[PDB]
């Protein structure tokens, strides 16, 4: 037998439903989302870190000239200066006070500490949401991992299920992402090759060992003024470090919907948002026909004190009369009240106490026992606490969210005006008919 | 530090402790089953926007109904008296004249 | 679970109330004022004989 439903995607909250197959006895169905994993598809644009500004040992053409070559280092920078006449600890280094050129050379490579200290730039696309479900029907309680897309079926032992598509697609990752040492950030890093000095991603490469590293750090060489040989240079600060300081908080503290971010691969677990349509083919073997199940004769509902809170702050009692000892399923046929227990051992005659939670100020909801329906009427007080360590297990609607006292006052106040305008129209019509008849 | 907590919930991380999640309740002051004096105060804190909108709606609807009352009654009174207002010895049922004179 | 009452200040007389948490069986609460001393703020001005 195939059943369709729409389960709220809130990990840690059972959802209960009843399947009433006409031939068979009613069966319970409680569904829990044990875990979710929203994982996107990503491609690595580049990696970046602190550049090491390496400066090759300078060469001098002692009484001649030199020309700047065209190398393929990262941010490669070469200049030639005129007569320098350098000196060393050994002493003078050349024999021409003029035309004693020097060639200044500098470029960058990855710092030796970049192996651990580096950042990866990724792009994300549409993310596919995968869910692990624990689903119980009657006694069976198998689990299963499935993809929530509306197409791919999550075949289990025999329980077949299709889920989705998600009611509202959502992705915590913006279009561009950066992942550094576990932490995730949403930074619109500049594209590959578009290095700008002094900002994030000033040096980029396809991989740590890749030799085609490209960078633009605005390095510039100056004329050596002191007569000791040395090459001076000034360069913008490492934009990688600038970003590290101005990073802001990571996404583990900023992703919405209470989502716990994890890496390797990039993913978003336990993310509570939207509704998941689930269609499930429960096998008929677990079904039991009503000729063998106990059909109860008479049940009534008496509700104790109740309170509307996330916790199970409501209690009630069922006085029942049935025809056999068995395992009838109990259920709530309202969206604003959910019971705790599902199956109760039922006798020929007796009573059962149950717990429930509601969101509505009044419990005005139908309880069903093995198909027999009875209306519970109650009046739940406001909760005494202010904060709980549990999530609210049931949504709060509008219709069953105002007490019948308020409802009666509102309906009286509106019905007064409605009846008054109706009576006024009727009076005008009647006056016209009386004038016409006695004219 | 003061933190506003919504019904969807809130999470705070303090130091190196593991995250703590807490969810709000609906424990507004007042009573949802008492006199309307209690109703309004209870529902204003949960949803002041909606509560004010509904109260205004009711107030307007009452004023509409009352205005309509006169708009109909007075006209009917008019058309039921004016034919007899220009006649001798207007032997109207006295209940109608009394009702229409007020 | 916080419960608020107004116990009459009468020594030796127990006062009984019922606490009703919504999801739980009621519990009985007996409050007895075993002793009470009222002490003022006092300061010696002098002694005499």
The DSSP secondary structure of A90-127, one letter per residue, reads S-B--S-SSS--EEEEEEEEE-TTTTTS-EEEEEEEEE
Q: Is A312 within 8 Å of C23 when comparing Cβ atoms? A: yes
Q: How many CB atoms lie within 10 A of CB A40?
A: 20
Helix, strand or coil, per DSSP, at residue A18: strand
The number of C-alpha atoms within 13 Å of A405 and in the hemisphere containing its C-beta is 18
List the A366-369 sheet strands across, edge first. Answer: A343-346, A326-332, A366-369, A372-375
Which residue reads 């499930």 in tokens?
A: A280
Sign of the torsion formed by the C-alpha atoms of A128, A129, A133 and A137? negative
For chain B, the farthest-separated pair of C-alpha atoms sits apart, in whole angstroms, at 100
Burial grade of B40 (CB within 10 A; 0-12, 13-18, 19 or more)? middle
Closest of A359, A396, A364 to residue A379, by C-alpha: A364
A129: three-class secondary structure by DSSP = strand
- In the numeric block, which tokens belong to residue B28? 């507004």
Hey, how many other C-beta atoms are within 10 angstroms of the C-beta on A356? Answer: 25
Other C-beta atoms lying within 10 Å of the C-beta of residue A219: 20
CB contacts < 8 A (A, B): 106
Q: φ, ψ for residue A318 (rounded to 5)?
A: -115, 120
In angstroms, the first-to-last Cα distance of chain A is 73
- Determine, for residues C23 and A314 on separate chains, whether the beta-carbon distance falls below 8 Å: yes
- C45–A contact, CB cutoff 8 A: no
Stated resolution in angstroms: 4.1
Verify B-C touch: 3 or more CB pairs within 8 A: no
User: Nearest to residue A26, comparing CAs of A346, A294, A355, A283?
Assistant: A294
Select from A165, A169, A162 the least CA-distant residue to A133: A162
Name the helix (H) or strand (E) containing A253: none
Q: What is the C-alpha separation between A180 and A47, in angstroms, rounded? A: 10
Among the listed residues A334, A287, A342, the one whose alpha carbon sits nearest the alpha carbon of residue A32: A342
**Cβ–Cβ < 8 Å for B91, B99:** no
**Contact between A293 and A23 (Cβ < 8 Å):** no
- Beta strands of B6-59 (E only): which ranges? 10-12, 20-24
Contact status of A355 with chain C (Cβ, < 8 Å): yes
* Contact in structure between C30 and C15 (CB atoms under 8 Å): yes
Question: What is the CB-side half-sphere exposure of residue A18 using CA atoms within 13 A?
Answer: 25
Helical pair B36-46 and B48-81, crossing angle rounded to 10 deg: 130
CA dihedral B79, B81, B84, B86 (to 10 degrees): -90
Specify the DSSP element, H or E, that contains B28: none
Experimental method: cryo-EM
Q: What's the rounded Cα separation, in Å, for the pair A164 and A6?
A: 9
Minimum CA–CA partner of C4 in chain A: A384
Is residue A360 within 8 Å of A400, Cβ to Cβ? yes
Q: Does A386 touch chain B (CB under 8 A)?
A: yes
Q: What distance in Å separates the CA atoms of residue A104 and residue A217, rounded to the nearest whole number? A: 17
Q: How many CB pairs under 8 A join A and C?
A: 21
d(CA A79, CA A192): 27
Which of B13, B33, B100 to probe the A interface (max A CBs under 10 A)? B33
* C19: phi then psi, degrees, rounded to nearest 5: -90, 130
Q: Reduce the DSSP state of residue C13 to 3 states and report it.
A: coil
DSSP B46-78: H-HHHHHHHHHHHHHHHHHHHHHHHHHHHHHHH
**Which residues of B are less than 8 Å from A417 in CB distance?**
61-62, 64-65, 68
User: B77, B100 in Cβ contact below 8 A?
Assistant: yes
Rounded to 5 degrees, φ, ψ at A428 are -60, -45
Q: Which helix (H) or strand (E) holds A432?
A: helix A404-437
Residue A215: phi, psi to the nearest 5? -150, 160
**CA A348 to CA A52: how far, in whole Å?**
85
Identify the three-state secondary structure at position A430. helix
3-state secondary structure of A238: coil
Residues of C in contact with A338 (CB under 8 A): none
**Contact in structure between A202 and A48 (CB atoms under 8 Å):** yes
Sheet with A337-339, side-by-side order of all strands:
A298-306, A314-321, A349-358, A337-339
B58 Cβ under 8 Å from any chain A Cβ: yes
Does C46 contact A at CB distance below 8 Å?
A: no
Q: What is the largest CA-CA distance in chain A?
A: 139
CA dihedral A201, A206, A211, A217 (to 10 degrees): -10
Cβ within 8 Å, pair C22-A309:
yes
What DSSP character marks residue B86? T
Interface test with A, best of C23, C24, C27 (most A CBs within 10 A): C23
The two three-digit tokens of residue A68, written as one number: 């700047």
- Breaks in chain A (C to N over 2.5 Å), named by the residue before each, are none
φ and ψ at A348, to 5 degrees? -60, -50
Contact A342, A27 (CB under 8 A): no
d(CA B84, CA A438): 12
CA A228 to chain centre: 62
Check: CB of residue A80 under 8 Å from CB of residue A64: no
Distance between A276 CA and the closest CA of chain B, angstroms: 18
The closest alpha carbon to A183, from A130, A244, A115, A123, belongs to: A244
Rounded CA-CA distance A145/A166 in Å is: 16
- Residue A207 is given by DSSP the state S
* φ/ψ (deg, to 5) at A247: -65, -35
Under DSSP, the state recorded for A402 is S
Handedness of CA A271, A272, A277, A281 (dihedral sign): positive
Query: Phi and psi (nearest 5°) for A305?
Result: -60, 140
Q: Is A378 exposed, middle or buried (0-12, 13-18, 19+ CB in 10 A)?
A: buried
Q: Does A412 touch chain B (CB under 8 A)?
A: no
Q: Cα(A119)–Cα(A184) distance, rounded to whole angstroms?
A: 10
CB A18 within 8 A of CB A331: yes
CB within 8 Å: A306 and C22: yes
Neighbours of B3 (CB within 10 A): 7
Task: Give the span between the Cα atoms of A385 and B66, in whole angstroms.
Answer: 44
Contact A29, A282 (CB under 8 A): yes
Token readout for A265 is 């691969």
Look at chain C and count its residues: 49
CA distance A190 to A197: 11
Whole-number Å distance between alpha carbons of A296 and A70: 93
Rg (CA), chain C: 20
A378: left (phi over 0), alpha (psi -120 to 50) or beta: beta
Nearest to A424 among B7, B27, B68 (CB): B68
Going by their DSSP bridges, the two strands A27-48 and A267-269 should be labelled as antiparallel
Whether A386 and B27 lie within 8 Å, measured CB to CB: yes
Chain A contact for C4, CB < 8 A? Answer: no
Q: Does B65 touch chain A (CB under 8 A)?
A: yes
Q: For CA atoms C1, C5, C11, C12, give the dihedral sign.
A: negative
Residue of A nearest to B84 (CA): A435
Question: CA B52, B53, B55: angle at the middle one, nearest 5?
Answer: 65
d(Cα A240, Cα A261) in Å, to the nearest integer? 23
* Exposed / middle / buried, residue A132 (Cβ in 10 Å: 0-12, 13-18, 19+): middle
H/E stretch holding A79: strand A74-81
Q: What angle do CA B25, B30, B32 make, to 5 degrees?
A: 80
CB nearest to A420's CB, from B31, B68, B79: B68
Cβ atoms A281, A2 nearer than 8 A: yes
Q: Which residue of C has its CA nearest to A312?
A: C23
Neighbours of chain B (3+ CB pairs under 8 A): A
**How many residues can be counted in chain B?**
102
Q: Which residues contact A200 (CB under 8 A, 6 or more apart)?
A: A48, A178, A187, A189, A190, A239, A240, A242, A243
Q: What number of helices (H) and strands (E) belong to chain C?
A: 0, 2
Burial class for A320, CB neighbours closer than 10 Å (0-12, 13-18, 19+): buried
**What chain A residue is nearest to B57 in terms of C-alpha separation?**
A414
A211 token code pair = 């030799």
How far apart are alpha carbons A308 and A358 in whole angstroms? 5
């Amino acid at each position: 037998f195939e059943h369709a439903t729409t389960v709220p995607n809130v990990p840690g909250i059972p959802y209960k439903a009843l399947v009433e197959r006409a031939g068979y006895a009613p069966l319970n169905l409680e569904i829990t989302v044990v875990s979710s994993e929203l994982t996107p598809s990503t491609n690595k644009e580049y990696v970046t870190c602190k550049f090491h500004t390496v400066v090759p040992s300078p060469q001098v053409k002692c009484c001649g000239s030199l020309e700047c070559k065209a190398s393929s280092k990262a941010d490669y920078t070469c200049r030639v200066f005129g007569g320098v006449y350098p000196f060393m600890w050994g002493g003078a280094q050349c024999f021409c006070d003029s035309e004693n050129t020097q060639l200044s050379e500098a470029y960058v490579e990855f710092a030796p500490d970049c192996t651990i200290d580096h950042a990866v730039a990724l792009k994300v696309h549409t993310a596919a949401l995968k869910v692990g479900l624990r689903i119980v029907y009657g006694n069976t309680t198998a689990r299963l991992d499935t993809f929530v897309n509306g197409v791919t079926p999550g075949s289990s032992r025999d329980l077949k299920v299709i889920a989705g598509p998600i009611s509202a697609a959502f992705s915590p990752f913006d279009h561009k992402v950066v992942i550094r040492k576990g932490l995730v950030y949403n930074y619109d890093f500049p594209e590959y090759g578009a290095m700008n000095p002094g900002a994030f991603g000033d040096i980029q490469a396809s991989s740590l060992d890749a030799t085609d590293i490209v960078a633009r750090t605005d390095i510039r060489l100056l004329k050596p003024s002191v007569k000791n040989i040395h090459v001076p240079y000034t360069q913008a600060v490492s934009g990688y470090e600038m970003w590290k300081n101005n990073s802001g908080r990571p996404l583990q503290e900023t992703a919405p919907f209470g989502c716990k971010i994890e890496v390797e691969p990039l993913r978003a677990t336990n993310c509570a948002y939207g509704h998941i349509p689930i269609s499930i083919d429960i096998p008929d073997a677990a079904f039991v026909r009503s000729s063998e199940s106990p059909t109860i004769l008479e049940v009534s509902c008496t509700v104790a004190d109740c309170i509307y809170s996330a916790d199970f702050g409501g209690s009630l009692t069922l006085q029942y009369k049935a025809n056999r000892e068995g395992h009838c399923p109990v259920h709530s046929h309202s969206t604003t009240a959910v019971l705790k227990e599902a199956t109760t051992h039922v006798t020929a005659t007796g009573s059962i106490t149950l717990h429930f939670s509601t969101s509505s100020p009044q419990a005005n909801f139908i309880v069903s026992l093995c198909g027999k329906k009875t209306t519970c009427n109650a009046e739940c007080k406001p909760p005494a606490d202010h904060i709980i360590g549990e999530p609210h297990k049931v949504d709060q609607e509008f219709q069953a969210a105002v007490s019948k006292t308020s409802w009666n006052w509102l309906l009286a106040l509106f019905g007064g005006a409605s009846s008054l305008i109706v009576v006024g129209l009727i009076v005008l019509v009647c006056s016209s008919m009386l004038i016409n008849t006695r004219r | 530090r003061n933190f506003s907590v919504g019904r969807e919930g809130l999470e705070y991380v303090w130091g190196n402790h593991e995250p703590v999640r807490v969810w709000a309740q609906e424990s507004a002051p007042g009573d949802p089953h008492g006199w309307p004096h209690e109703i309004i105060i209870h529902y204003y804190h949960r949803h002041p926007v909606y509560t004010v909108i509904v109260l205004c709606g009711v107030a307007l609807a009452i004023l509409v109904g009352t205005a309509s009352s006169a708009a109909c009654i007075a006209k009917a009174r008019r058309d039921c008296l004016t034919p007899y207002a220009l006649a001798p010895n207007a032997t109207v049922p006295t209940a109608l004249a009394v009702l229409c004179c007020i």
